[PDB]
Design a protein around this ligand. Structure first.
Ligand SMILES: Nc1ncnc2c1ncn2[C@@H]1O[C@H](COP(=O)(O)OP(=O)(O)OP(=O)(O)O)[C@@H](O)[C@H]1O
Ligand SMILES: Nc1ncnc2c1ncn2[C@@H]1O[C@H](COP(=O)(O)OP(=O)(O)OP(=O)(O)O)[C@@H](O)[C@H]1O
Ligand SMILES: O=S(=O)(Nc1cc(CC2CCCCC2)n[nH]1)c1ccccc1Cn1ccnc1
Ligand SMILES: CC(=O)N[C@@H]1[C@@H](O)[C@H](O)[C@@H](CO)O[C@H]1O
Ligand SMILES: [K+]
Ligand SMILES: [K+]
Ligand SMILES: [K+]
Lengths: 30, 281, 396, 335, 50, 167, 56
């Protein structure tokens, strides 16, 4: 169960990184 | 009074209307025989060790037969539990569908029609997927506890005198923990649902929030929901840990009392260290 | 045959005071009870007054707390002292068994020390609850007197040349070390507070979250024993038994568990990682490194507690095997025989062959193991909840 | 055994929009908060108390406030601890001197007739409680024992003085006597001389007279100023409508305390319709006075909620003249 | 690892073989859990359709 | 006699660190907060307010520290009060009041102004009168400020947050 | 020096009023008597304190 949870967490972290590296609201500072 | 309700009548009606008689009898017999064999293998091992510690002979076959019988009994118990759960789920689903089909449209209009769908989907899924495993685990745990208590009492007759106040304390702790935990789980669910609702509404209306410049207010609301869910989970885990430490201390006291009684009886009753190891383990 | 504190053997030969009073084995043992009886006689009226006041106290319902420096160190020192005193009690019981007479001086001082330690830790808890540091003078005096008596006992043993081969000598040295550590802790607390000689004390106010009346989760701000045993949850469970638990019952979360605070900490960790390494992409390994750098100070503690519990797990089987091996001998009349001055000191191997000693060690090991397991579970759950809140805030 | 984990693939997807909390909703009419109870004992809870040891600083005050059983327990524990400590000191002194050793009486013992810890404890008891059997006498060759005796005598005298003072202070208390005052269960409001007034009856049970009787009337309610101030429990003094204006009264028979409701009085805009239970209104009457026996001021506290006010009612006469004196029927106090 | 090391002294090779039985059965339980997860996914999609 | 002393108990009274002045009912008044820590009630509570300042008469008299009594603006005029929760003590500044010609500009540190409040009352335990003395300098006066509410109602009773005494 | 109820009463008087003649001494082998002596001393001190307070 620990190993399966670790694998699922790795998949989740990869998916979250991919989501974070997506498009963002431009010209926010301006 | 309404909250404090174990409600065994609902479980009894469920068993009578979905399982039957043969399946329940087979399940009970399999569980009882399996735990009887679990006691018997330990007893036979203790007797064999005591005899070997120098009629009697090498029990290279009786122990193997007992182990095989225990394995077969466990397999039969698991298969019967799963088959009974599957059949119960099927029959209950069919009965519920038949009742829903033959229901008045006036009652349909009166009912919100959302609670019916929730009970038809989520409750049925929990019954089909969680009820059999939960029942099997609970039965195995309680039967193992009963077997351990019986073995301890058999090893040391004077154990029950200290056990009875400990049993009362355990009953009180279990009652209080269940009463608290039901409300804790309900609050956890009713706090985690609004967080998901807020996330969905924020995702749907991101442009609207950006136009209205309410991002700070929405972030504050999300933080409040997250804090509520987190504190509810923290309280639930605190209750779980308090129950765990209480039960662990009770078990440690039981171990200490049993060890002291066994040591005292070793020099007087001459247990020959046979039942001592079984009681300790 | 009346009850004699010293050895009644040889027409009460243990009461002789020749060749120096300090050379008498029973005399130093009697001296060691003086700090314990003094501490009892001082604390018992104080504890009675405190209990009577609490019986009709209304300000303590929502009174705040201010933990003194080295709170966890004090608690662990008290626990180690209790364990050492239990070991001394067991050794005395084993030693005096061979002697026909009781030889009360072997174990009665140890029991008095155990009771004194319990009273002292209760007194320290009361002083922590009610911020009155001036009352620590009596505790400091007790610590100094106990340390002096233990040092006298240790030097007497050294003159008798007990050596490290004697469990009694080892336990005496350990007790001396523990008393010295407790004295150092008390001195450090006094120095921090500056309440005895310095005109202006450096008082410390309770934390704002604790002062807030909308906070009910008192686990972070509790005594170490209360936090470990989850003792503060008893009142919550009692209230839940009668009144159903609602949002009103669940108080506001403290500052340490704030989702906003966790989000700010995560952002600080991300900024620090970006400053240290100029890596434009934000990879999974980078996220893992940031999470480790953000939550290691609790993850390592939880892992250490779990490791300690696992190590103490084998103590069960070890004690069981030892007990059965000891009981496997047909002859049990035999007793350890190692006499130096009539005290019949017991070696480590002979001491470990006692079934009662093994059972007591097993009980203590199980208690510590399961307590550490529960603590590790709680720490891991709290860390995971904080990480979940921070991640949710970052996603938002 | 074991269990399962919280693996939720989609949380049944359709499992939503359940609603229907079915809450009991019984907290609406649970209870009404009272500032003080009918028998004093102000029901006010203190929170965020930041004490700096001043609670334990007043050790004597805490001892006096302690009940009689607690005081007796503290007395016994303190005396037993002192006796045990002194007995242990004497035993240690005897052991150091060597007189405890059952040897020949070649040397003069530090303390005579010392044979065991029981004998040492008996000697300590005799010394501290000044019994002096004399069998266990003190030799002249034990200066340390002499100094210990002096210290023990000083400690015993100080402890006796402290305990006597605490006992006297506890005996001087008269709160139970202060509880003997009787107030009307429900107050009434009725017209007097064409003017509406708030009447109330107060009486005493014990024949002992209370000197310097002084009664204070106040109204506790939430008052908000036009400037925007929010006062949760605003207290306004209420005059007794006395002939001279003073609060001094001469209470022998149960008297009727009435306050004339004038324009300046805050009760000038009150109606019997708004006299229900859940009303932001509470009348507090505080009676002060010294006892002729103890000479200690006593305080009586009572509360009258809006539901406890009997609009349009009149107290029945309570005093009836007899052949030689007057009689008071205390069973008519609340009629 | 610590338990196996101490049990080697306690009993010997037979205890090591008995422990290795469970050690080898653990990946079997992992595979059974994976198959159970696949079956649960199929049941979940069927139940969602229903 | 030493045991009968209760000066330490008298020290348990709590007064506002800085006093405030604000309008009430269209009238300016000098507010101040006083509270008690111990649950023991003090009987016969009596508070006296005076102003200490150098006052020179038109006749030429020079008084270094002139003390003038200040009324409490009570509903009945008496100084007797019932203190359970920390109460707000306010004095209405009328024409006859010496504070009738005061401005926030002249409320600096080095100002010939000092407010003295003396509280008297007997202890229900010892029966001994106790005195509380506090001072409020001009720099200690918070012009145009209002004390926050301190009492909060609970399910069964009322609660006082003593951490809000000086806010 | 215990011979009759009169002697017992004299010993009780000496103990309670702290006279201590010493002819009727207390042995070290009577723990029940020691406890009774302690209780009697406590009761006498409490009674004296109460009576003094009432007199004052
Ligand atoms: N005759 C009496 N003797 C003692 N106490 C009395 C008497 N009459 C009333 N009280 C007290 O008055 C308080 C009000 O409660 P209770 O209803 O008993 O009295 P009441 O309204 O004055 O009744 P009653 O009709 O007797 O005048 C109580 O504390 C009660 O003890
Ligand atoms: N909660 C409290 N408990 C005890 N004393 C208090 C408390 N609050 C204030 N005081 C006392 O009030 C006096 C004023 O100093 P301090 O600044 O500490 O208080 P304050 O102005 O009332 O503060 P706060 O913001 O807590 O109300 C001090 O004597 C202080 O001890
Ligand atoms: O016994 S545990 O503490 N279990 C437990 C689950 C939660 C969930 C909360 C946190 C998430 C939200 C709901 C409440 N809190 N505690 C336990 C601890 C550590 C390892 C193994 C176990 C046993 N285990 C595992 C799965 N099921 C039982
Ligand atoms: C422990 C020991 O040896 N004690 C001795 C005893 O054996 C001997 O009989 C006695 C002389 O009478 O002196 C002492
Ligand atoms: K005497
Ligand atoms: K004498
Ligand atoms: K005498």
């Amino acid at each position: 169960s620990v190993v399966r949870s670790t694998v699922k967490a790795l998949v989740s972290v990869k998916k979250l990184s991919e989501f974070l590296s997506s498009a963002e609201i431009r010209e926010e500072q301006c | 009074l309404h909250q404090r309700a174990k409600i065994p009548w609902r479980a009894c009606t469920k068993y009578l209307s979905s399982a039957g008689i043969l399946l329940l009898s087979l399940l009970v017999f399999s569980q009882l025989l399996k735990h009887m064999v679990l006691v018997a293998i330990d007893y036979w091992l203790a007797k064999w060790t005591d005899s070997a510690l120098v009629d009697q002979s090498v029990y290279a076959m009786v122990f193997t037969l007992l182990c095989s019988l225990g394995i077969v009994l466990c397999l039969v118990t698991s298969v019967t539990v799963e088959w009974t759960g599957l059949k119960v789920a099927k029959r209950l689903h069919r009965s519920l569908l038949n009742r829903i089909i033959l229901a008045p449209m006036r009652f349909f209009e009166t009912t919100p029609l959302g609670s019916i769908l929730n009970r038809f989907s989520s409750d049925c899924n929990t019954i089909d997927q969680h009820i059999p495993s939960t029942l099997e685990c609970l039965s195995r745990s309680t039967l193992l506890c009963v077997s351990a208590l019986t073995v301890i009492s058999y090893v040391t007759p004077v154990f029950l005198v200290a056990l009875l106040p400990l049993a009362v304390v355990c009953y009180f702790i279990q009652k209080y923990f269940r009463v608290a935990s039901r409300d804790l789980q309900q609050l956890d669910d009713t706090t985690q649902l609004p967080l998901l609702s807020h996330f969905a509404e924020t995702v749907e209306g991101l442009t609207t929030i950006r136009a209205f410049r309410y991002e700070a207010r929405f972030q504050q609301k999300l933080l409040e929901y997250t804090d509520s869910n987190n504190i509810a989970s923290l309280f639930l885990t605190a209750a779980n840990r308090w129950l765990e430490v209480r039960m662990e201390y009770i078990g440690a006291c039981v171990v200490l009392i049993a060890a002291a009684t066994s040591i005292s009886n070793s020099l007087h009753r001459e247990l020959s260290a046979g039942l001592v190891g079984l009681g300790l383990t | 045959m009346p009850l004699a504190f010293c050895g009644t053997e040889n027409h009460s030969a243990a009461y002789r005071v020749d060749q120096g009073v300090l050379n008498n084995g029973c005399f130093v043992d009697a001296l060691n009870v003086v700090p314990h009886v003094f501490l009892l006689f001082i604390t018992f009226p104080i504890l009675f007054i405190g209990w009577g006041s609490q019986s009709s106290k209304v300000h303590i319902h929502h009174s705040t707390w201010l933990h003194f420096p080295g709170h966890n160190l004090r608690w662990i020192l008290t626990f180690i002292l209790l364990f050492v005193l239990v070991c001394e009690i067991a050794e005395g019981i084993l030693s005096d068994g061979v002697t026909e007479s009781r030889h009360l001086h072997l174990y009665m001082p140890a029991g008095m020390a155990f009771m004194a330690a319990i009273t002292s830790v209760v007194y320290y808890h009361n002083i922590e609850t009610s911020n009155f540091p001036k009352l620590l003078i009596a505790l400091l005096i007790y610590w100094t007197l106990a340390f002096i008596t233990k040092t006298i006992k240790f030097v007497k043993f050294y003159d008798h040349a007990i050596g490290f081969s004697q469990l009694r000598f080892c336990l005496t040295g350990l007790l001396v070390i523990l008393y010295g550590m407790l004295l150092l802790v008390e001195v450090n607390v006094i120095r921090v507070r500056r309440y005895i000689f310095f005109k202006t004390p450096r008082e410390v106010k309770p934390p704002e979250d604790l002062q807030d009346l909308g906070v009910r989760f008192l686990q972070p701000f509790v005594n170490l024993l209360s936090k470990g045993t989850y003792w503060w949850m008893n009142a919550f469970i009692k209230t839940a038994h009668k009144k159903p638990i609602d949002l009103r019952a669940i108080g506001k979360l403290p500052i340490a568990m704030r989702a906003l605070t966790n989000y700010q900490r995560l952002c600080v960790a991300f900024d620090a990682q970006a400053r240290k390494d100029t890596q434009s992409p934000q990879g999974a390994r980078a996220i893992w490194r940031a999470l480790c750098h953000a939550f290691g100070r609790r993850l390592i503690l939880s892992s250490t507690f779990r490791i300690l519990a696992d190590l103490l797990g084998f103590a069960g089987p070890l004690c069981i095997f030892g007990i059965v091996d000891h009981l496997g001998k047909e002859n049990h009349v035999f007793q350890p025989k190692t006499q130096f001055l009539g005290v019949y000191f017991v070696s480590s191997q002979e001491f470990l062959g006692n079934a009662y000693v093994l059972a007591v060690l097993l009980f203590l090991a199980l208690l510590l193991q399961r307590t550490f397991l529960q603590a590790s579970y709680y720490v891991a759950i709290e860390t995971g909840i904080n990480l979940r809140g921070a991640i949710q805030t970052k996603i938002y | 055994m074991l269990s399962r984990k919280g693996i939720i693939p989609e949380e049944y997807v359709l499992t939503r929009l359940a609603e229907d909390p079915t809450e009991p909703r019984y907290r609406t009419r649970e209870r009404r908060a009272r500032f003080v109870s009918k028998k004093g004992n102000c029901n006010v809870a203190h929170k965020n108390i930041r004490e700096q040891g001043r609670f334990l600083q007043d050790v004597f005050t805490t001892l006096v406030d302690l009940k009689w059983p607690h005081t007796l327990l503290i007395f016994t524990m303190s005396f037993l601890c002192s006796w045990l400590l002194f007995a242990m000191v004497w035993w240690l002194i005897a052991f150091a001197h060597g007189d405890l050793a059952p040897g020949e009486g070649t040397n003069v013992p530090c303390v005579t007739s010392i044979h065991s810890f029981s004998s040492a404890f008996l000697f300590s008891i005799e010394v501290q409680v000044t019994i002096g059997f004399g069998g266990r006498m003190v030799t002249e060759e034990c200066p340390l024992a002499i100094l210990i005796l002096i210290v023990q005598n000083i400690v015993g005298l100080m402890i006796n003085a402290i305990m006597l003072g605490c006992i006297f202070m506890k005996t001087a208390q008269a709160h139970r006597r202060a509880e003997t005052l009787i107030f009307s269960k429900h107050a009434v409001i009725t017209l007097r001389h064409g003017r509406l007034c708030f009447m109330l009856r107060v009486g005493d049970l014990r024949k002992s007279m209370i000197i310097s009787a002084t009664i204070h009337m106040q109204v506790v309610r939430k008052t908000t100023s036009p400037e925007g101030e929010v006062v949760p429990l605003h207290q306004v003094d209420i005059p007794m409508e006395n002939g001279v204006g003073g609060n001094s009264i001469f209470l022998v028979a149960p008297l009727i305390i009435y306050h004339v409701i004038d324009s300046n009085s805050p009760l000038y805009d009150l109606a019997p319709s708004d006299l229900h239970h859940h009303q932001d209104l509470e009348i507090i009457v505080i009676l002060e006075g010294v006892v002729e026996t103890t000479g200690i001021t006593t305080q009586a506290r009572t509360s009258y909620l809006a539901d406890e006010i009997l609009w349009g009612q009149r107290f029945v006469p309570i005093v009836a003249e007899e052949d030689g004196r007057y009689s008071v029927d205390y069973s008519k106090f609340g009629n | 690892i610590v338990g196996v090391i101490l049990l080697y002294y306690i009993l010997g090779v037979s205890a090591l073989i008995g422990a290795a039985v469970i050690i080898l059965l653990a990946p079997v339980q992992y595979f059974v859990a994976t198959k159970l997860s696949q079956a649960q996914r199929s049941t979940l999609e069927h139940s969602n359709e229903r």
